[PDB]
Amino acid sequence: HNYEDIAQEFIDFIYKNPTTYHVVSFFAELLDKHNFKYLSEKSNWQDSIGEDGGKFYTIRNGTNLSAFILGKNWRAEKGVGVIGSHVDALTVKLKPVSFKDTAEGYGRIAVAPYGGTLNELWLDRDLGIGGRLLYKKKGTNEIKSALVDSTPLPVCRIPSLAPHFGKPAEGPFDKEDQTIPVIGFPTPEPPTDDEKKSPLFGKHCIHLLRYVAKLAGVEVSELIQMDLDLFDVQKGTIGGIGKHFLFAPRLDDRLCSFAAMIALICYAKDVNTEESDLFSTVTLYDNEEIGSLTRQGAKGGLLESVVERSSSAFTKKPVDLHTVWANSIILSADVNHLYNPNFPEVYLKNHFPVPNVGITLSLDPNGHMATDVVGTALVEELARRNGDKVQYFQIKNNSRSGGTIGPSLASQTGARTIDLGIAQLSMHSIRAATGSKDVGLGVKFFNGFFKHWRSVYDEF
């Protein structure tokens, strides 16, 4: 029943938080409810973090979050127990100017792919709109932001051409000229003088501006800018004749992000920082799907920043960060590939995971993963101590591998990093699948990590 319940919570989480902004906001609220104190990056933390340590979190760009627990008795030699995952997922972004003239009466919006989207899997899917709106209340100068979400209303859909037309209906399709979202077909109010005051007037259809303004509860004239996504509004579902699966969009990598954060929360419940000598954290990054080379991506170093700022404010004595990282363990948690029975030729025998068993170690000898022999032994020892099962995933020698933030974090910190994650089918599809038990199994494993990684690594 526990696994079923957490599976449902995950489904609701995915459904109610479609964009990276919503996901980060969701975790921030969860953290607040569990007494983690928010610290602003733009302020020095010397007086915010005392010698008793505590539970805190910070956010960068509204899409990069780091939650951490610092014990009163922590010292550099104890290192840091880290779980890094990414909260961005393949999606479709409205262009800076999404406005398009009507085509034979059809209303459409100009968009661009974020990652490998706008392909055949994105055709004929109900797409909602949502994201971040920047506005300036009339009469003021302060710029504020609001999050909007059309769910359950699918405002647009990219229409496939009927096969009846022949060759023109065969893919692949041009992402600029053919995979364009259709948003409506209006029939014969004109822009008001006040609406025309918006810096966005003309850059987006007045109907769209009025719609998002209404969702945010502000005036069109107050809209300053926006960063909106188009996403599948179909709610996730437990599937399979025996209910062995969970079908849902954007699993990569909110599946691991969710599991890691919930594990951190469950773990934190029994941790009193006044009697703890550990430093634990779950850091969630944006932009992994586009290379991670952005200030809000893994290469932006929020993790390193949090550890340095915290250790500096924490004690009056200098902290040797090189010693800290040398004694740390970073779990780069990113979903990997579940065996797909219909494509046996691309999976390496003895090196593929199956549903509802446990976390999957990502192994690669050519640098695609940071996992090493010691890290592998550590995870397997951990699992043995906690009653967890560990699976493997490595590509066939004649295949190719995707990447993760693992190597970046390992190189940037110098800390042993282990790439692993909850395996899923159809990675990067608009609607993927994993085991109905995998969310709970993932939480269990990550919870065990925070509880016992230090004692286990001591044996090495």
The footprint of its own copies on residues 5-24 (CB under 8 A) is: none
Q: Which residues of 181-206 are buried (b: 16+ CB within 10 A; e: fewer)?
A: bbbbeeeeeeeeeebeebebbebbbb
Q: Which does 340 bind (CB under 5 to 8 A by kind): its own copies, Zn ion, none?
A: its own copies
Helix orientation angle between 373-386 and 438-458, rounded to the nearest 10 degrees? 110
Q: Which residues contact 294 (CB under 8 A, 6 or more apart)?
A: 286, 287, 300
Amino acid in the structure at residue 325: W
First CA to last CA across the chain, in angstroms? 37
Distance of CA 459 to the CA centre of its chain: 33
Report the site for its own copies in 173-232 (rule: CB under 8 A). Answer: 174-180, 182-187, 199, 203, 207-208, 211, 224-227
Residue from 103, 194, 274, 387 touching its own copies (CB under 8 A): that is 103
**What's the closest the beta carbon of residue 10 comes to its own copies, in angstroms?**
16
Q: Decide if 285 contacts 298 (C-beta within 8 A).
A: yes
Nearest to 276 by CA among 445, 457, 78: 78
**What's the closest the beta carbon of residue 437 comes to its own copies, in angstroms?**
10
Report the site for Zn ion in 253-272 (rule: CB under 5 A). Answer: 253
Helix orientation angle between 438-458 and 2-16, rounded to the nearest 10 degrees? 100
- Binding-site members for Zn(2+) are 86, 252, 288-289, 334, 428
How far apart are alpha carbons 449 and 456 in whole angstroms?
A: 9
Examine residue 323 and tell whether it contacts its own copies (CB under 8 A): yes
Report the site for Zn ion in 333-352 (rule: CB under 5 A). Answer: 334
Examine residue 137 and tell whether it contacts its own copies (CB under 8 A): no
Instruction: Name residue, tokens 């960063």.
Output: 227
Examine residue 460 and tell whether it contacts its own copies (CB under 8 A): yes
Q: Which does 253 bind (CB under 5 to 8 A by kind): its own copies, Zn ion, none?
A: Zn ion
**What's the closest the beta carbon of residue 417 comes to its own copies, in angstroms?**
7
Q: In the 8-state DSSP scheme, what is residue 48?
A: T
Examine residue 99 and tell whether it contacts its own copies (CB under 8 A): yes
Examine residue 286 and tell whether it contacts Zn ion (CB under 5 A): no
Q: Which does 106 bind (CB under 5 to 8 A by kind): Zn ion, its own copies, none?
A: its own copies
Among 66-74, 258-266, 293-301, 444-452, which window interacts with its own copies (CB under 8 A)?
Answer: 293-301
**What's the closest the beta carbon of residue 176 comes to Zn ion, in angstroms?**
23
Nearest to 136 by CA among 197, 210, 224: 224
Residue sitting closest to Zn ion (CB):
253
How far apart are alpha carbons 414 and 430 in whole angstroms?
A: 35
List contacts with Zn ion (CB under 5 A): 252-253, 334
